[PDB]
């Protein structure tokens, strides 16, 4: 950590192409500020 050329993405349904994501964000799941863990579903993981 001292990386820029790595871009987020998701592989396609077939499994031979990657769909690039335009932008990303940080969502917390371990601080004692919100409750995103319980509201979200297990299948959504």
Approach to solving: cryo-EM
**Tokens 């001292």 — which residue?**
2
Q: Which two tokens stand for residue 11?
A: 């592989």
Q: For every residue of 1-45, which 3-state class applies, written as one string? A: CCCCCCCCEEECCCCCCEEECCCCCCCCCCCCCCCHHHHCCCCCC
Q: How far is CA 7 from CA 23, 34, 38, 39, in A?
A: 9, 28, 29, 29
Q: Which two tokens stand for residue 1?
A: 């950590």
Distance CA 5, CA 15 (A): 22
Distance CA 11, CA 21 (A): 11
Cα–Cα nearest to 44, from 26, 28, 36, 7: 36
**Tokens 């863990």 — which residue?**
37
Q: Are 17 and 11 in contact (CB under 8 A)?
A: yes
Cα–Cα nearest to 10, from 26, 25, 21, 22: 21
């Amino acid at each position: 950590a001292d990386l820029q050329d790595f871009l987020p993405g998701r592989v396609t349904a077939d499994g031979k192409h990657i769909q690039k994501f335009s932008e990303t964000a940080r969502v917390p799941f371990y601080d004692k500020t919100q409750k995103h863990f319980d509201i979200l579903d297990e299948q959504e993981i």
